[PDB]
Amino acid sequence: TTPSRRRLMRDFKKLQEDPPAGVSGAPTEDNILTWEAIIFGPQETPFEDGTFKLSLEFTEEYPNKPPTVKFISKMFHPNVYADGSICLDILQNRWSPTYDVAAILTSIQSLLDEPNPNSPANSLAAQLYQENRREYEKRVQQIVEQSWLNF
C-alpha cells in the first residue's frame, strides 16, 4: 500500500488503457516493483521485426528515483551494456518523476534507431554505427532473430 506501489498501479492502468504501438509490459505477479516488458523493433529501421524482452526494476523511492531497465533479449546497440543495461539520460540525470512506464518504454523504443552518441556503453556498436553501418545492421538482424526465442 506504499506510495511507490500505488503509482506503479496507476502506471499500469494508463499503459493498458492506451498502450503505445509495439509496447507492452506488466509487473511480475509476485512483485509489483519488478516488471517485464516488450518493445517491437521500430517499423522502418534495422531493428524491424524485433521482439525485445526487457526487465524494469523499481525501488520504493519511485517515482522520485528512476528504475533500472535492462534488455533480457540479447542486444547490440551503442547505448546498451553487456548485461543488457540501457544507458538512457531520462533514467539517469534527465529523469522526471512525471515520466511513467509508458514514457520509459517509448523512449527506449525511439533510442533503438537513434543511438545517443555521447558516451557509448557498447564500443564495437558505436563504431560500426558511424564507421560501417552495413556491418552494424548485419549484427542487429542477428539480434532481431534471436529476440524471437524470447517471447
UniProtKB/Swiss-Prot annotation:
Knockout-associated phenotype: Worms are viable, fertile, and do not show any obvious anomaly.
Reactions the enzyme catalyzes: S-ubiquitinyl-[E1 ubiquitin-activating enzyme]-L-cysteine + [E2 ubiquitin-conjugating enzyme]-L-cysteine = [E1 ubiquitin-activating enzyme]-L-cysteine + S-ubiquitinyl-[E2 ubiquitin-conjugating enzyme]-L-cysteine
Pathway annotation: Protein modification; protein ubiquitination
Region annotation Disordered: where it falls in the sequence: 1-27
Top EC class, one word: transferase
UBC core domain span: 3-149
Active site: C87
GO molecular-function terms, A-Z: ATP binding; ubiquitin conjugating enzyme activity; ubiquitin protein ligase binding
EC number(s) recorded for this UniProt protein: 2.3.2.23
Keyword terms of this UniProt record: ATP-binding, Nucleotide-binding, Transferase, Ubl conjugation pathway
Gene Ontology biological process terms, A to Z: DNA repair; proteasome-mediated ubiquitin-dependent protein catabolic process; protein polyubiquitination; protein ubiquitination
Family label: Belongs to the ubiquitin-conjugating enzyme family.
Role description: Catalyzes the covalent attachment of ubiquitin to other proteins.
Self-association state and partner proteins as the record states: Interacts with ubr-1 and rfp-1. Interacts with ubc-13.
Name of the protein: Ubiquitin-conjugating enzyme E2 1
Native source species: Caenorhabditis elegans
Gene: ubc-1
